[PDB]
Amino acid sequence: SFGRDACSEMSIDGLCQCAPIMSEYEIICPANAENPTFRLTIQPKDYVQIMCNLTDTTDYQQLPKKLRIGEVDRVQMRRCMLPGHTPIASILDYLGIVSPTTLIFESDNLGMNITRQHLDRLHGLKRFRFTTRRLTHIPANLLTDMRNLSHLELRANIEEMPSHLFDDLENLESIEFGSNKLRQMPRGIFGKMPKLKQLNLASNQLKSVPDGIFDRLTSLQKIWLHTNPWDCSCPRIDYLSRWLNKNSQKEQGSAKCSGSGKPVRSIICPTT
Ligand SMILES: *[C@@H]1O[C@H](CO)[C@@H](O)[C@H](O)[C@H]1NC(C)=O
Ligand SMILES: *[C@@H]1O[C@H](CO)[C@@H](O)[C@H](O)[C@H]1NC(C)=O
């Protein structure tokens, strides 16, 4: 585990400087640099933040060596690059970060397309947040083996969602897919979700949803569908209008119609 003694040792060799600030530790890599490659914030056994400023993936050599942070709950990686075709878990391993419950990877400088390999050796993760302003295509295998995952947030201007994205992810409790550019939803995307309580599909580009999309969401408590250009023509909006009327208590905010602006829940489709 990383402490005051481990922090003191770093300020002798000169590779990286450590400073005991408040109840945590601020690590600057390289030490004495105006614009450091790494800015680490370590609050022992609780939280570890990695503030990056890399021109290329090669700069990961500037990371503190022989560092043994140990067990940490939350890991926040801001502006960091994917270490090529190597898992993000390697950066965690190099720093001695053991069994993280949460991982937040926010970066507009990824350098490449996020693959299943970047998320490898992270099957024990409970919470995962991946944010990028850049146009990102998500593969179907990306979240495989992430079976212990209960919270997932993906804000990446994603246009299409692969159908087998949540294949063998039954422990999921919360999904945040807000402020993406999603036009569609696959038919059996939320098939095996017996533990999902919260689902956020707001601020997307959804005109419709396939019939029965939320029927297998038995544990659902909250749902966000607002700020979507919902096509409220019948019989297309029937399932969603009926579902949002029956599960009005679950709806957070109000999903409105493209033309009128009337809540989707207030639309009553006829039978023909
Ligand atoms: C990142 O590093 C470059 C030099 O490579 C520097 O010009 C820039 O100001 C740095 N940015 C931040 C936010 O530190
Ligand atoms: C990611 O992959 C897609 C094809 O699946 C490609 O069109 C896109 O340009 C790639 N992204 C980057 C940043 O190269």
Numbering used by the authors: 28 to 299
Give the article text.
Upon structure determination using a combination of single-wavelength anomalous dispersion of the iodinated species and molecular replacement the atomic structure of the protein could be analysed and the crystal contacts revealed. The atomic structures were determined for both native and derivative forms at 2.4 and 3.0 Å, respectively. The derivative crystals diffracted to a much lower resolution (3.0 Å for the best data set) than the native ones (best at 2.4 Å). According to their respective solvent content of 62 and 59% for the native and derivative crystals, the latter were expected to diffract better. Either incomplete substitution or the additional handling during back-soaking was detrimental to the quality of the derivative crystals. Surprisingly native and derivative crystals were found to belong to different space groups even though they had similar bipyramidal morphologies. However, I3C binding at the concave side of each protein, interacting with charged residues of the leucine-rich repeat region, modifies the packing of the second molecule by tilting it along its long axis by approximately 40° compared to the native structure. This in turn increases the crystal symmetry. The fact that the protein crystallized in two different space groups suggests that the Liesegang-like phenomenon is independent of crystal packing.
Toll is a transmembrane glycoprotein that functions as a cytokine receptor and is critically involved in both embryonic development and immunity in fruit flies. It is the founding member of an important family of germ-line-encoded pathogen pattern-recognition receptors in mammals, the Toll-like receptors (TLRs). In this study we used the N-terminal domain of Toll encompassing the 201 first amino acids produced as a VLR hybrid protein, a strategy that can generate stable deletion constructs established for mammalian TLRs. Here a counter-diffusion method was used to improve the X-ray diffraction quality of the N-terminal domain of Drosophila melanogaster Toll receptor crystals.
